[PDB]
Design a protein around this motif. Structure first.
Motif, mmCIF file in Angstrom:
data_model
loop_
_atom_site.group_PDB
_atom_site.id
_atom_site.type_symbol
_atom_site.label_atom_id
_atom_site.label_comp_id
_atom_site.label_asym_id
_atom_site.label_seq_id
_atom_site.Cartn_x
_atom_site.Cartn_y
_atom_site.Cartn_z
ATOM 1 N N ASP A 124 0.803 -1.227 0.000
ATOM 2 C CA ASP A 124 0.000 0.000 0.000
ATOM 3 C C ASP A 124 0.836 1.277 0.000
ATOM 4 O O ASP A 124 0.257 2.365 -0.086
ATOM 5 N N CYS B 88 -6.085 3.073 -0.976
ATOM 6 C CA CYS B 88 -6.259 1.852 -0.207
ATOM 7 C C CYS B 88 -7.427 2.035 0.764
ATOM 8 O O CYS B 88 -7.744 3.148 1.180
ATOM 9 N N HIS B 89 -8.127 0.942 1.056
ATOM 10 C CA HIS B 89 -9.283 1.031 1.943
ATOM 11 C C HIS B 89 -8.836 1.503 3.328
ATOM 12 O O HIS B 89 -7.835 1.026 3.868
ATOM 13 N N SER B 90 -9.562 2.469 3.898
ATOM 14 C CA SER B 90 -9.212 2.918 5.240
ATOM 15 C C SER B 90 -9.675 1.949 6.345
ATOM 16 O O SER B 90 -9.126 1.982 7.454
ATOM 17 N N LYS B 141 -13.097 4.087 9.257
ATOM 18 C CA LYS B 141 -12.049 3.499 10.079
ATOM 19 C C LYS B 141 -12.440 3.341 11.543
ATOM 20 O O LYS B 141 -11.982 2.366 12.159
ATOM 21 N N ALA B 144 -13.710 -0.117 12.266
ATOM 22 C CA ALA B 144 -12.701 -1.166 12.226
ATOM 23 C C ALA B 144 -11.777 -1.106 13.431
ATOM 24 O O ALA B 144 -11.268 -2.145 13.870
ATOM 25 N N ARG B 145 -11.507 0.090 13.952
ATOM 26 C CA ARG B 145 -10.797 0.170 15.222
ATOM 27 C C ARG B 145 -11.574 -0.575 16.313
ATOM 28 O O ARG B 145 -11.000 -1.353 17.087
ATOM 29 N N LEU B 148 -11.329 -4.332 15.855
ATOM 30 C CA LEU B 148 -10.017 -4.800 16.277
ATOM 31 C C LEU B 148 -9.938 -4.874 17.791
ATOM 32 O O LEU B 148 -9.558 -5.905 18.354
ATOM 33 N N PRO B 169 -5.545 -5.877 10.952
ATOM 34 C CA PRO B 169 -5.571 -5.031 9.752
ATOM 35 C C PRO B 169 -5.218 -5.860 8.534
ATOM 36 O O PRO B 169 -4.338 -6.721 8.575
ATOM 37 N N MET B 170 -5.967 -5.648 7.470
ATOM 38 C CA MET B 170 -5.729 -6.387 6.244
ATOM 39 C C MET B 170 -4.554 -5.763 5.504
ATOM 40 O O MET B 170 -4.417 -4.538 5.443
ATOM 41 N N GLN B 172 -3.023 -4.735 2.392
ATOM 42 C CA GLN B 172 -3.485 -4.424 1.041
ATOM 43 C C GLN B 172 -2.327 -4.529 0.064
ATOM 44 O O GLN B 172 -1.360 -3.764 0.141
HETATM 45 C C1 LIG Z 1 -4.853 3.245 3.026
HETATM 46 C C2 LIG Z 1 -4.568 2.195 4.033
HETATM 47 O O1 LIG Z 1 -5.111 1.077 3.939
HETATM 48 N N1 LIG Z 1 -3.707 2.469 5.025
HETATM 49 C C3 LIG Z 1 -3.414 3.790 5.595
HETATM 50 C C4 LIG Z 1 -2.299 3.681 6.612
HETATM 51 N N2 LIG Z 1 -2.699 2.728 7.669
HETATM 52 S S1 LIG Z 1 -1.704 2.680 8.989
HETATM 53 O O2 LIG Z 1 -1.197 1.348 9.076
HETATM 54 O O3 LIG Z 1 -0.798 3.777 8.847
HETATM 55 C C5 LIG Z 1 -2.721 3.003 10.394
HETATM 56 C C6 LIG Z 1 -3.550 4.117 10.400
HETATM 57 C C7 LIG Z 1 -4.445 4.299 11.440
HETATM 58 C C8 LIG Z 1 -4.510 3.372 12.467
HETATM 59 O O4 LIG Z 1 -5.391 3.345 13.520
HETATM 60 C C9 LIG Z 1 -6.523 4.224 13.496
HETATM 61 C C10 LIG Z 1 -3.672 2.267 12.462
HETATM 62 C C11 LIG Z 1 -2.777 2.077 11.426
HETATM 63 C C12 LIG Z 1 -3.199 1.487 7.070
HETATM 64 C C13 LIG Z 1 -4.026 0.355 7.669
HETATM 65 O O5 LIG Z 1 -3.610 -0.801 7.689
HETATM 66 N N3 LIG Z 1 -5.251 0.692 8.123
HETATM 67 C C14 LIG Z 1 -6.210 -0.281 8.638
HETATM 68 C C15 LIG Z 1 -6.387 -0.209 10.137
HETATM 69 C C16 LIG Z 1 -5.296 -0.346 10.986
HETATM 70 C C17 LIG Z 1 -5.439 -0.244 12.359
HETATM 71 C C18 LIG Z 1 -6.691 0.000 12.906
HETATM 72 O O6 LIG Z 1 -6.909 0.108 14.256
HETATM 73 C C19 LIG Z 1 -5.768 0.146 15.122
HETATM 74 C C20 LIG Z 1 -7.792 0.135 12.071
HETATM 75 C C21 LIG Z 1 -7.635 0.032 10.698
HETATM 76 C C22 LIG Z 1 -2.967 1.369 5.631
#
Ligand SMILES: *CC(=O)N1CCN(S(=O)(=O)c2ccc(OC)cc2)[C@@H](C(=O)NCc2ccc(OC)cc2)C1
Lengths: 247, 251
Positions: A124, B88-90, B141, B144-145, B148, B169-170, B172
């Motif tokens: 990504d 990418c999916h949030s 998002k 999904a938090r 998790l 987290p998936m 991507q």
């Molecule tokens: C576009 C995408 O899929 N992303 C954006 C970047 N993030 S991250 O790994 O930087 C991240 C952002 C926010 C966050 O918590 C709110 C945790 C990680 C990506 C990602 O994998 N997002 C999915 C995700 C990850 C964690 C949580 O909860 C902790 C929810 C959703 C990749």
């Protein structure tokens, strides 16, 4: 509607449809007039008596539409079954070196046969993960590349690390398993007595859930340490590789 | 042939039919946005960063957005080459260790507890049988938090079988566009790495020796990983037979 994704070749295996439950006979041409609305069609095959066939549409998009629009449609007295044929010749390439593009991957694997597509997979952030995909038009080419890439050391760049080529493990994360296709037997009914819920302390479920969560953690330990020995052994051998090439 | 063709199981206006548009001229307007993309049907939310020169627009189906994306990418507008892409999916989660007899619908019902579920799929193998892994994509998002956090602290059970799902987290991966040559910086280092075309290492040669050591290392990895996989398999199936006994010792 003339739509072709940039790079996509036409009439590849990825736009080839299986057609099932056909009614007895159905001339080739009839098959064609059903799929008329969805663009030109190359290979057509109908089976003598077992009532199935294949059609090769132009683009993957055209075939997706035709797939979901015709899947289950009745004709005479029977439901059509329309699905994307299983690819006969898709390969996973592992440990790609740095500076490899889709087009380099394609060129390299062109020596084994005609290549329908090759993609260097990116995460990504747009960095390559190190895995690729190579799909040939025919099973013979992928057999050549499978065999020759295990017997010899196939090198894509000057970096002396050969790629590993294995058959592609075809998973479907798009249609999945619709409730209609679940096997509905006694075990089904046993699974479904309770709805989704969080296990509550003091129940018989809670005790086993915690044992499972613990087991998953025992797997994280074991596996996190193999990763240890593995990232070490590779870094050791890759330094020597880089140093060696310093010449 | 109809515009609104919807892949079965596809809701409208998801993250997955949202396109991002970058490199906008400073005098882009929302009305311009909608006009660029009319043709591709109804448009939902349209946002335009007042000055970072990007925006995004929710199309109705992933199919329309894929056509818009190819047609509009690299279109010039008042001095600028427009860059149109999928993000990418949030809010996209991986679910591991599904119990049996789980369907996309069940999976989505289950996770709809945490927020609005855009899409849920039980991943099926090439002979149609469940892999035990699943995807769940929420519209936002924060849903999904929650999923998790709650599936990690508690034991989330989709059926009567006492095995909680793992939810993470998936990851991507793009296996569609990939790494096109045009994107690669074609400098000194690029050309040194490309000096030797694709080839087989021939015996008696500095590559040949090192490729062999790598092949040996791969083999060693595989063997080690097969030892773990088998131990894991035996331990999982022991606890899983206990779980099954314990669920019959109810029924
Ligand atoms: C576009 C995408 O899929 N992303 C954006 C970047 N993030 S991250 O790994 O930087 C991240 C952002 C926010 C966050 O918590 C709110 C945790 C990680 C990506 C990602 O994998 N997002 C999915 C995700 C990850 C964690 C949580 O909860 C902790 C929810 C959703 C990749």
């Amino acid at each position: 509607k003339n739509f072709r994704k940039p790079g996509e070749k036409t009439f590849t295996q990825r736009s080839r449809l299986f057609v099932g439950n056909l009614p007895p006979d159905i001339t080739e041409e009839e098959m064609r007039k059903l799929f008329e609305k969805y663009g030109k069609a190359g290979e057509v095959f109908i089976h003598k008596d077992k009532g199935f066939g294949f059609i090769r549409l132009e683009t993957r998009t055209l075939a997706e539409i035709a797939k979901v629009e015709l899947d289950n449609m009745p004709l005479r007295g029977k439901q059509l079954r329309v699905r994307f044929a299983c690819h006969s010749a898709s390969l996973t390439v592992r440990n790609l070196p740095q500076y490899v593009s889709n087009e380099l991957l394609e060129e390299a694997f062109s020596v084994f046969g005609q290549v329908e597509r090759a993609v260097v997979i990116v995460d990504d952030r747009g960095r390559p993960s190190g895995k690729g995909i190579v799909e040939f038009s025919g099973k013979p080419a992928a057999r050549k590349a499978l065999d020759r890439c295990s017997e010899g050391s196939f090198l894509l760049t000057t970096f002396p690390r050969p790629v590993t080529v294995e058959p592609m493990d075809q998973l479907d994360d798009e249609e999945g398993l619709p409730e209609k296709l679940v096997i509905k037997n006694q075990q089904f009914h046993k699974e479904r007595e309770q709805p989704p819920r969080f296990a509550q302390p003091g129940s018989f479920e809670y005790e086993y859930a915690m044992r499972w969560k613990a087991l998953i953690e025992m797997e994280k330990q074991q596996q996190d340490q193999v990763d240890r020995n593995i990232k070490e052994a590779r870094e050791k051998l890759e330094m020597e590789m880089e140093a060696a090439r310093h010449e």
